[PDB]
Amino acid sequence: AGTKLSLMPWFHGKITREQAERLLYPPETGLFLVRESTNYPGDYTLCVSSDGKVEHYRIMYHASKLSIDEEVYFENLMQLVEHYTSDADGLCTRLIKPKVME
């Protein structure tokens, strides 16, 4: 049993920035994961490989709504990933391929 988010192949839970860097190597544009900081529950960073390195997009919450750009907002993290899977909408790349959680 788990939450929907817990079962999402791109969701790695509480891993560090440095551990994400090792998971997203070698670079492959559009390979991605989301990790959570131990600082605070639901403090997420979307980590995506693009143009030979990892880009890190930290989620913010504004009145409980999630964004990574202060332009486009979502109710939850799964909606955010869904959106950027289909088009870049200003990100460095679409989220093309999950780095599958093991």
Author numbering: 73 to 174
What does the paper say about this structure?
C-terminal Src kinase (Csk) and Csk-homologous kinase (Chk) are members of the CSK family of protein tyrosine kinases. These proteins suppress the activity of Src family kinases (SFKs) by selectively phosphorylating the conserved C-terminal tail regulatory tyrosine. Csk and Chk both contain SH3, SH2, and kinase domains, which are separated by the SH3–SH2 and SH2-kinase linkers. The Csk SH2 domain is crucial in stabilizing the kinase domain in the active conformation.
Crystal structures of both oxidized SH2 and C122S SH2 were solved and refined. Intrinsic fluorescence of oxidized and reduced form of L-SH2 domain, as well as that of the cysteine mutants C122S and C164S L-SH2, was measured to examine the role of the disulfide bond in the stability of the Csk SH2 domain. U,W0 of the reduced, oxidized, C122S and C164S L-SH2 are 27.5 ± 0.7, 42.2 ± 1.6, 29.4 ± 0.9, and 26.3 ± 0.9 kJ/mol, respectively. All of the three forms of L-SH2 without disulfide bond were greatly destabilized compared with L-SH2 containing disulfide bonds with free energy value reductions ranging from 12.8 to 15.9 kJ/mol. The S–S distance of the disulfide bond was 2.0 Å, whereas the O–S distance in the C122S mutant was 3.7 Å. X-ray crystallography data were also consistent with the NMR observation, in which most of the changes in chemical shift took place in the residues close to C122, and this area was likely to undergo greater structural change than in the C164 residue area. Although the side chain direction of C122S residue was slightly different, the overall backbone position was nearly identical to that of the oxidized form and superimposes on the structures of Cα atoms that display a root-mean-square deviation of 0.19 Å. The overall backbone position of C122S and the oxidized form in the crystal structure is nearly identical, suggesting that the disulfide stability results from reduction of entropy of the unfolded state. Comparison of the crystal structure of the different forms of SH2 suggests that only minor structural changes resulted from the disulfide bond.
